[PDB]
Structure formats: C-alpha cells, structure tokens
Curated annotation (Swiss-Prot):
Amino-acid positions noted as binding Ca(2+) 4 in the UniProt annotation, renumbered to this chain: 52, 54, 56, 58, 63
Stretches assigned to the EF-hand domain: 3-38, 39-71
Full protein stretch here: 76 to 146 of 146
UniProt-recorded name of the protein: Calmodulin-like protein 5
Residues annotated as binding Ca(2+) 3: 16, 18, 20, 22, 27
Underlying gene: CALML5
Tissue specificity of this protein: Particularly abundant in the epidermis where its expression is directly related to keratinocyte differentiation. Very low expression in lung.
Assembly mode: Associates with transglutaminase 3.
Highest taxon, organism lineage: Eukaryota
Role this protein plays: Binds calcium. May be involved in terminal differentiation of keratinocytes.
Length: 71
C-alpha cells in the first residue's frame, strides 16, 4: 500500500503489544531500523509529539497510525 501507514504498522510489529495495546516510543525508534531510516531522530521526534496519548510516550498501538497520518 504505502509507507507512512504500512511501514509504520510493520514498524510497530517489532515492539507491538497486540492491537489497541500500547507501544514504547523508543522501541518505535528502534523498529524504524527495520524499515530504512535507522534512528530517524527527526521523523521519530516529530511523531514523539503526536505519541502523547497518556502524557509521556505511551500511544495506543493502533490509534498511533491514525496520528501518523494526521490528515
């Protein structure tokens, strides 16, 4: 389909809980090494701000994708 979305769900699958579970934002940064841009500090940082579901760096694993594609 597309990066951003498919890429990011495939990213998630490194450190996913189980679907509408939680990610570890840092693990997320690690996961991106599987994609192409390992330690994409900016691309992650950009998403880090969106990854604020709690008030820290917890994101609903699925809901994340919805924020990735902030359109």
């Amino acid at each position: 389909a597309r990066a951003g979305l498919e890429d990011l769900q495939v990213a998630f699958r490194a450190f996913d809980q189980d679907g509408d579970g939680h990610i570890t934002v840092d693990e997320l940064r690690r996961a991106m090494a599987g994609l192409g841009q390992p330690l994409p500090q900016e691309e992650l940082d950009a998403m880090i701000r969106e990854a604020d579901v709690d008030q820290d760096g917890r994101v609903n694993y699925e809901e994340f994708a919805r924020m990735l594609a902030q359109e």
